[PDB]
Amino acid sequence: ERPTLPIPDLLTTDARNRIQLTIGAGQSTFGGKTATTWGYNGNLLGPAVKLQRGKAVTVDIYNQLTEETTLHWHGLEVPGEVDGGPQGIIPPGGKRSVTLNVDQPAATCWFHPHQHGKTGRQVAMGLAGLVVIEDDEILKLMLPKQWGIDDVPVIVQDKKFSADGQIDYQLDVMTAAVGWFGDTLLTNGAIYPQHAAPRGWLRLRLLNGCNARSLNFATSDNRPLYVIASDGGLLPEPVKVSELPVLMGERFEVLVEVNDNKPFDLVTLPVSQMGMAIAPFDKPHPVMRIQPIAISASGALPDTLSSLPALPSLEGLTVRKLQLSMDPMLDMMGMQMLMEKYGDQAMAGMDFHHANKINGQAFDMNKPMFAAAKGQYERWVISGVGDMMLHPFHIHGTQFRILSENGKPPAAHRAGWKDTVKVEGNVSEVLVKFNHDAPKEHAYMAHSHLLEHEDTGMMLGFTVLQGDHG
Numbered sequence: 361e362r363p364t365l366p367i368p369d370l371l372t373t374d375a376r377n378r379i380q381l382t383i384g385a386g387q388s389t390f391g392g393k394t395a396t397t398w399g400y401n402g403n404l405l406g407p408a409v410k411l412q413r414g415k416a417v418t419v420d421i422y423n424q425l426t427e428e429t430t431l432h433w434h435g436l437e438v439p440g441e442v443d444g445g446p447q448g449i450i451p452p453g454g455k456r457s458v459t460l461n462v463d464q465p466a467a468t469c470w471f472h473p474h475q476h477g478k479t480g481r482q483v484a485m486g487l488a489g490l491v492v493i494e495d496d497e498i499l500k501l502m503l504p505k506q507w508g509i510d511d512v513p514v515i516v517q518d519k520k521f522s523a524d525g526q527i528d529y530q531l532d533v534m535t536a537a538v539g540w541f542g543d544t545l546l547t548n549g550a551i552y553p554q555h556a557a558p559r560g561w562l563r564l565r566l567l568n569g570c571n572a573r574s575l576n577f578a579t580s581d582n583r584p585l586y587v588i589a590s591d592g593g594l595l596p597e598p599v600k601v602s603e604l605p606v607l608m609g610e611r612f613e614v615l616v617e618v619n620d621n622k623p624f625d626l627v628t629l630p631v632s633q634m635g636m637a638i639a640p641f642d643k644p645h646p647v648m649r650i651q652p653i654a655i656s657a658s659g660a661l662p663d664t665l666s667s668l669p670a671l672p673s674l675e676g677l678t679v680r681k682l683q684l685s686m687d688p689m690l691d692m693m694g695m696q697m698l699m700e701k702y703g704d705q706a707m708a709g710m711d712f713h714h715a716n717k718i719n720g721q722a723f724d725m726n727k728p729m730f731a732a733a734k735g736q737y738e739r740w741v742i743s744g745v746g747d748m749m750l751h752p753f754h755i756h757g758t759q760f761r762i763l764s765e766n767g768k769p770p771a772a773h774r775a776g777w778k779d780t781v782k783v784e785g786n787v788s789e790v791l792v793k794f795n796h797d798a799p800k801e802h803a804y805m806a807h808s809h810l811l812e813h814e815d816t817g818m819m820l821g822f823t824v825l826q827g828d829h830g
């Protein structure tokens with residue numbers, strides 16, 4: 361029998377208004393082999409922290425690893441001091457506390473390490489958790505809302521393991537060039553689980569938690585997915601899709617219909633990204649089995665969900681150009697190693713530690729590239745012209761609107777609030793506004809979310825201090 365889908369615990373504040381997260385090493389089992397893994401409040405992955413718009417929470421973070429880490433709340437708009445970028449060091453055996461004052465629409469965000477140069481390994485070892493933000497608006501909708509029954513998080517990740525069963529992560533030339541990817545797909549940490557869902561509407565909060573692998577969700581029997589929310593919250597109305605591409609670090613919430621006596625699989629379809637259509641990912645691959653059950657369910661697919669504000673006029677806004685690049689030598693060496701090992705299938709459908717760059721500079725923790733304005737829209741133009749690697753570009757401190765995505769206006773289910781934009785051999789443009797401060801000592805990051813590229817230099821720091829005084 362397939363294992364049941366693990367359900368992260370939904371963790372709320374205690375009487376002291378505190379949430380405790382312990383970062384630690386333990387053991388997990390994959391395919392009958394034990395592996396050392398890391399987790400928040402457990403052996404692997406983490407809980408779902410539940411936050412309400414307009415309410416403060418204090419998080420106490422206990423680092424019980426033997427190495428430094430940081431804790432970043434990806435998708436949360438918070439000041440730099442509590443954003444948990446690479447400057448937010450938590451010593452091994454130490455504790456750090458942050459007060460989060462949540463001020464943004466309901467959405468599914470997530471959290472993960474951001475340790476300088478080591479983010480890929482620390483996520484690969486198992487660290488990731490979820491953030492569920494609620495507000496008044498969303499609860500009035502009739503959405504499926506029973507956590508772990510008809511409202512379920514789905515954190516999808518690949519791993520590769522060595523013969524001893526341990527997770528096999530090394531940041532070497534090939535993995536630095538193409539990304540860390542594996543042959544084993546996990547869904548909330550389990551291999552091909554089943555989830556028992558009541559007849560009616562099932563809400564899936566999908567996260568691509570892979571280091572480097574893009575995904576493309578669909579159902580085994582071609583039933584549609586109704587997209588209701590993206591990274592930064594609800595869309596204005598549901599968007600019906602037959603397939604749903606999801607970049608690394610992106611979330612979408614979808615509703616799917618569950619009918620009596622008709623089990624089906626959520627699957628991922630082959631993608632056109634270097635290295636990612638190697639067997640078993642050359643064909644549709646299962647993510648999990650949905651098994652209909654007969655218990656109570658009241659959830660609805662609402663005709664209307666929210667209102668999206670009009671894009672502001674673009675005239676007169678500051679433009680920032682961010683040119684992404686990879687060292688041609690790393691690109692050539694890594695691509696050759698990939699082709700030699702896997703052959704043509706590795707391109708199907710198509711020293712090095714500071715090799716990857718933005719505007720000619722590898723990330724410098726001591727030197728923010730610029731100071732962005734506070735409380736003012738800017739247009740950021742991000743280019744990957746010059747290579748054909750996938751760069752899901754993420755900017756801390758904001759939920760943004762995509763104006764142009766890699767050659768075209770964004771797809772309808774990508775036109776709302778986003779914290780990731782596709783850049784791949786073309787140029788994208790986003791409209792951003794920073795509402796919180798970030799000083800040089802706790803700067804915001806902007807980077808590709810292909811973690812091995814972030815780790816080898818494709819990140820910049822930026823500060824936010826003041827708006828116009830002119």
Ligand SMILES: [Cu+2]
Pocket residue numbers: 434472609809
């Ligand atoms: Cu992230």
Ligand SMILES: [Cu+2]
Pocket residue numbers: 432433434435754755756757
């Ligand atoms: Cu982030």
Ligand SMILES: [Cu+2]
Pocket residue numbers: 432474754756805807
């Ligand atoms: Cu980041």
